[PDB]
Structures are given as structure tokens and as C-alpha cells.
């Protein structure tokens, strides 16, 4: 892993990002969820790198990246990704993938940097904005986590994040997720919670997308359910919809091989169509 100060068009203009960059060829940038870190995507980075160049950053406020107090908007996170790609000399097109909050970041990137996208991978995510109650919940989480840290988030979220089969067959995956959450910087968690509350509605963005899009969901995802994601895919042109069996909200970790293969075979199509 690497740590680099990048130039970003978002406040504060410069930020230190930690990231992995593994493989050669077509760049595929994978964005973790909330309140996780780059290691969420480890299996896909380690396996897809035989064929693609896989770049996996810690978002601002997460993992080993710099924490920027206040509000970390989805736009700002996307701006940081554009800055990272600029740093790396990936100044043309990329494939951008994200899970859940990382999907929100991908929408923000697509709004602003459409000419930089060869493709989008939207995993276990939603196009709608937060409802008023959800926004209030963000705010209450932000104010709590600043002072108490993310233990309460792990307690609340872990039963909702993975399916029963993962708890039974892969307790080590559950523990790895728990440690990601417990290690998340408190102010980074807070800033991202507030940022999620202010993200725009991406409903009308969907029909305007201009690249192939893979829409991936766990069969048992309790947070961004498959029926909702299917409906989302029906408004995205050039979509492919994949349900990963025997996974909840974190397919990349729960069913790593199946996720890697779905992404690999779709990337080959995108490449052929391009």
C-alpha cells in the first residue's frame, strides 16, 4: 500500500490518501462502503490483478487516509478519486465500482466526471437520497460517534450486513468486518454520515448514464434489497443485473469468488464493446 498527498478540487485542496494499486492494464477503481476501508475489496484486488489494474483507496476519513472534519460530501469523495487518478497518470477512462456508500460516491463521480468513465459497477446501493428520518439518523450517529467511537455502529450494523450463512461458515469474515468498523476514525465516520445525509437524489441521473453498468446485489441483502436494485437497473441503460447467492449486503467479502467472477466476465464484455 501507498500513501500520497493528492490534489483535489474539493476542500481542502490537498489530501493524503492511502491506497492499493495492483496489476496492469485497464484501470478498475473500487470504492468501499460505510464505515469500512479498502480491505473490503481485498479478494477482488488480489484476484483481478492478473488481468486488470485494480486501485482501491481508503476514502477521506477512513482507513489510513487523512481525516477531514466537518462534512465529507459524496461529491468531495468523488473529487478525491479524480485527483488520485490524475496523480497516477490515469487521466483517461476508468471503470469505477462502489459498494453502498461507495455507490453513492460513484453516482457523484458520474455526475461530474462522465467523460472519465468506461463503466460503472454499482454493488448493494441505492439511487434515492435519504428520507427525512434517515437524515436525522445520520446526524444522531455523527454526533454520537464523535464522542463514543464506532462500537455502537458495529453492534447495530453487523447483524444487518451479512447473511446467516456467512455467520455460520465464515465467522472470520464477520470478525474482519467488525474490526474495520471498530477501527474507523470517529470524525471520519461522522463527516461521512453528514455527507450521506446531504447527498442528492440520483434517480434522474440513472437514465442519463453513458457507460455500461453492472448492478450487483446479494440475494439476502437486508439494507439495499435485491428487488430495489432490480428496479434501479430497469432505469439504467446498458445494465447487467447480477444476484449473488448466499450473500447479504457485503457480497465482496461474503462470496468473494462469485463477485470476482461476475466483475471479471463483465469487464471482458465492456472491453469488447468498447
Nearer to Mg ion, 101 or 214 (CB): 214
Q: 42 touches which of Mg ion, Cl ion, none (CB within 5 to 8 A by kind)?
A: Cl ion
Which region among 37-45, 64-72, 235-243, 252-260 touches Cl ion (by CB under 5 A)?
37-45
CA separation for the pair 101, 107 (Å, rounded) = 10
Give CA separation, 129 vs 40, 93, 104, 199, in Å: 24, 27, 9, 6
Q: 73 touches which of Cl ion, Mg ion, none (CB within 5 to 8 A by kind)?
A: none
Give CA separation, 146 vs 61, 62, 140, 167, 269, in Å: 12, 14, 10, 29, 44
Nearer to Mg ion, 44 or 213 (CB): 213
Nearer to Mg ion, 85 or 229 (CB): 229
Which region among 36-44, 99-107, 142-150, 168-176 touches Cl ion (by CB under 5 A)?
36-44
Q: 239 touches which of Mg ion, Cl ion, none (CB within 5 to 8 A by kind)?
A: Mg ion
CA separation for the pair 165, 196 (Å, rounded) = 30
Nearer to Cl ion, 60 or 116 (CB): 60
User: Contact, 108 vs 82, CB < 8 A?
Assistant: no
Residue 75 CB, nearest approach to Cl ion (Å): 26
User: Contact, 266 vs 240, CB < 8 A?
Assistant: yes
Residue 61 CB, nearest approach to Mg ion (Å): 33
Q: Cis ω on the peptide bond leading into residue 35 (within 30° of 0)?
A: yes
CA separation for the pair 56, 102 (Å, rounded) = 11
Residues with Cβ within 8 Å of residue 252, at least 6 apart in sequence: 40, 41, 43, 44, 99, 123, 259
Residue 191 CB, nearest approach to Cl ion (Å): 23
Residue 227 CB, nearest approach to Cl ion (Å): 31
Residue 98 CB, nearest approach to Cl ion (Å): 16
Scan residues 204-243 and list those touching Mg ion (CB under 5 A): 233, 236, 239
Q: 111 touches which of Mg ion, Cl ion, none (CB within 5 to 8 A by kind)?
A: none
Of 240, 62, 208, the C-alpha closest to 127 is: 208
Q: 39 touches which of Mg ion, Cl ion, none (CB within 5 to 8 A by kind)?
A: Cl ion
Provide the 10 A C-beta neighbour count for residue 85: 22
Is residue 44 a contact point for Cl ion (CB under 5 A)? no
Nearer to Cl ion, 40 or 153 (CB): 40
Q: Could you tell me the three cell numbers for 92?
A: 483517461
Is residue 228 classed exposed, middle or buried when 0-12, 13-18 and 19+ CB atoms within 10 A define those classes?
middle
Scan residues 50-69 and list those touching Mg ion (CB under 5 A): none
What's the distance, Cα to Cα, between the start and end of the chain in Å? 31
Query: For the window 114-143, what string marks contact with Mg ion as x by the rule CB under 5 A?
Result: ------------------------------
Residue from the set 26, 30, 37, 39 that interacts with Cl ion by CB under 5 A: 39
- Binding stretches for Cl ion (CB under 5 A): 39, 42
- Binding stretches for Mg ion (CB under 5 A): 233, 236, 239
Amino acid at each position: 500500500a501507498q500513501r500520497v498527498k493528492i490534489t483535489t478540487t474539493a476542500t481542502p485542496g490537498e489530501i493524503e490518501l492511502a491506497f492499493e494499486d495492483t496489476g496492469t492494464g485497464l484501470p478498475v477503481l473500487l470504492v468501499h462502503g460505510f464505515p469500512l476501508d479498502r480491505t473490503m475489496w481485498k479478494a477482488q484486488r488480489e484476484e483481478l490483478c492478473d488481468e486488470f489494474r485494480v486501485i482501491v483507496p481508503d476514502l477521506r476519513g477512513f482507513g489510513e487516509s487523512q481525516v477531514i472534519p466537518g462534512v465529507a460530501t459524496m461529491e468531495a469523495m468523488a473529487d478525491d478519486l479524480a485527483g488520485l487518478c490524475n496523480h497516477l497518470g490515469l487521466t483517461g477512462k476508468i471503470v469505477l465500482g462502489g459498494l453502498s456508500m461507495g455507490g453513492y460516491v460513484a453516482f457523484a463521480f458520474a455526475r461530474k466526471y462522465r467523460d472519465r468513465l468506461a463503466g460503472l459497477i454499482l454493488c448493494d446501493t441505492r439511487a434515492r437520497p435519504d428520507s427525512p428520518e434517515a437524515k436525522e439518523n445520520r446526524r444522531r450517529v455523527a454526533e454520537r460517534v464523535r464522542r463514543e467511537g464506532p462500537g455502537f455502529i458495529a453492534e447495530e450494523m453487523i447483524p444487518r450486513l451479512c447473511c446467516e450463512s456467512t455467520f455460520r461458515n465464515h465467522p472470520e469474515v464477520i470478525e474482519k468486518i467488525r474490526q474495520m468498523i471498530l477501527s474507523a476514525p470517529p470524525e471520519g465516520v461522522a463527516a461521512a454520515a453528514l455527507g450521506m445525509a446531504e447527498r442528492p437524489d440520483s434517480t434522474d441521473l440513472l437514465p442519463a448514464l453513458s457507460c455500461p453498468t453492472l448492478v450487483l446485489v446479494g440475494q439476502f441483502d437486508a439494507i439495499s434489497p435485491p428487488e430495489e436494485m432490480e428496479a434501479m437497473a430497469r432505469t439504467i441503460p446498458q445494465s447487467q443485473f447480477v444476484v449473488i447467492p448466499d450473500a447479504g449486503h457485503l457480497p465482496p467479502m461474503e462470496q468473494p469468488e462469485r463477485v470476482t467472477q461476475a466483475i471479471r466476465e463483465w469487464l471482458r464484455k465492456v472491453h469488447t464493446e468498447a
